[PDB]
Design a binder for this molecule. Sequence first.
Ligand SMILES: CC(=C(c1ccc(O)cc1)c1ccc(O)cc1)c1ccc(C(C)(C)C)cc1
Ligand SMILES: CC(=C(c1ccc(O)cc1)c1ccc(O)cc1)c1ccc(C(C)(C)C)cc1
Lengths: 231, 240, 10, 10
Amino acid sequence: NSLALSLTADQMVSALLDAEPPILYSEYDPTRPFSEASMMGLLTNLADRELVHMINWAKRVPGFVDLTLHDQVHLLECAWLEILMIGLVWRSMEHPGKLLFAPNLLLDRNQGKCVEGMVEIFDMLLATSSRFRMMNLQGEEFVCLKSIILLNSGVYTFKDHIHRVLDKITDTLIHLMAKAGLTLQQQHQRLAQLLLILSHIRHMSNKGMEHLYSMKCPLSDLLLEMLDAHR
Amino acid sequence: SLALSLTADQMVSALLDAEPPILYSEYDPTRPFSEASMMGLLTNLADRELVHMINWAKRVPGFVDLTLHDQVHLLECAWLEILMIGLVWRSMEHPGKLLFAPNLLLDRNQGKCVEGMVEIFDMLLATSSRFRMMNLQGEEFVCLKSIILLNSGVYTSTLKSLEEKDHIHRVLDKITDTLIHLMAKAGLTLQQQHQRLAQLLLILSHIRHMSNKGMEHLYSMKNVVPLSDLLLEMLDAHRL
Amino acid sequence: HKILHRLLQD
Amino acid sequence: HKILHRLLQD
Ligand SMILES: CC(=C(c1ccc(O)cc1)c1ccc(O)cc1)c1ccc(C(C)(C)C)cc1
Ligand SMILES: CC(=C(c1ccc(O)cc1)c1ccc(O)cc1)c1ccc(C(C)(C)C)cc1
């Protein structure tokens, strides 16, 4: 019982694709450049709005609905910045050297010098985006990786159902690579490469989180509660 | 390079042979426990393990091919991860216990005496429990530990040469091949092979998490408790 | 309690 | 210059 485990590989792909959250816009003020306040203002505002859509996306991730409410809360509180980051990184792929936070908010590493810790977090995000770009990450792979983050990042802090679903998503990934014409060796090599990048995404989240609840001295009440979960 | 010319069997034997020993702690069962002494025991242990780790890294295929600064960088990034997965591996057949040393076995209750320790302990216990349920093999463990060394620091020619990054990834691909070889050798089906491969690499994310959280608390008490010079420098690396 | 909850319910 | 550096160097 779950429905997710009964899905086929293509059913899994379409379901995840259809669940994809929209790309939101930042505020349309062309005033340049930014202060430390306005820069963090724009990003925080954006992140807070994205979170509302992330939570509806999560409910549509196969297997997530079968979890108890508190298990859903735990996984989201654990992985929210990871999920935002892999989204940002995916968005920025076609823009080498830049971070596409929103279609009207494309930033480079230089525009972050006005904030402590920003250049460092920017460079890592940029490195990740460049990595995805060199691997030619496909959208169908991206949605698999993102759902994996949701289910995996907090699973060790509770589980069998989640691992069964994680197994299903693995099957789906391999199915995608075989469909693309990759040899068997190429398939497991690519799987590994993709999953290992998730370790770095965790790192970026932890490092970013650490700064966030240090300078948390205006965050939305929701963002504060998500942030408070890591403290 | 030699790392790319090694078969899967040769990769395993090389990694197995390079395994560091299991060290003892200075644990005195007569001495009254204290927060400062418990952390002292763990710090002293880690500092001695670090020396073996550094010479272990040199024996990891492909690692010696890298420039010295890259070697330094990879170890500065991965040292706590490598210590932790080692601890977790030693603790597998000790349910609810962490085997820091043969004379230092600990449960989560003995961790409440320092702020932040019980949280790390629970995460480490959960990882060993995961390994125990998965029935992790030694040949798989040594592959995982060397993946961490080469992977954890690689995303941080040229202006910081990209040729090195490619060599590391080639070696990483070889270790992936080695993991798959082991799994097929164990009679697993293709579906089971890539599933177990995924399960293994996903645990590395949690190991990263434990290291990040552990590091965070570690450079907060740097609050009296004596760190060794090497440990102090490794810890400084996660700041600037 | 938490804003997350409500967002998850509806 | 760096303990790890020296140790890696021997
Ligand atoms: C890149 C990033 C964020 C962010 C998240 C929450 C905030 O309150 C502010 C920024 C982000 C990630 C993805 C996304 O779609 C939108 C926003 C971030 C940037 C800088 C930092 C500091 C280290 C400077 C605090 C932290 C997170
Ligand atoms: C589990 C762990 C450590 C450790 C590392 C460095 C130290 O100075 C002290 C302890 C460890 C890991 C593996 C190993 O083989 C030996 C030691 C650790 C325990 C507690 C903490 C705090 C959060 C309490 C700071 C950090 C790391």
